[PDB]
Amino acid sequence: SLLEFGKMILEETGKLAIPSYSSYGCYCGWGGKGTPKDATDRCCFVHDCCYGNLPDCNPKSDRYKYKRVNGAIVCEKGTSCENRICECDKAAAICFRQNLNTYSKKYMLYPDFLCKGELKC
């Protein structure tokens, strides 16, 4: 679920998901078009594709269970949708952590008209 993914992002990165990732670039938090602006935005593009792979799941509201094993995120077994949604969110949180070194505040509230073209998942 969205709130759960937000907490995972905060725990991972130390950034609050809103406002740090909720409107970043072309893909983080809204939008479906254009070339991702940077590696962080690419994480969101891939996460959007990940959710897109699950058209009969509901990642915004469906809560999955996961644990931290030392630092490792381990998705615990729930329904197939929860397992799949968890792996999507785990990957995005890791991706965000891997790219904090290039995260740029200049892409927060990035305007829609600068995001053009379909990029296929």
Binding site: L3, F5, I9, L16, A17, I18, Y21, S22, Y24, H47
Partner: peptide
């Protein structure tokens, strides 16, 4: 904070 994305 830390819902969205």
């Amino acid at each position: 904070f830390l819902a969205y994305k």
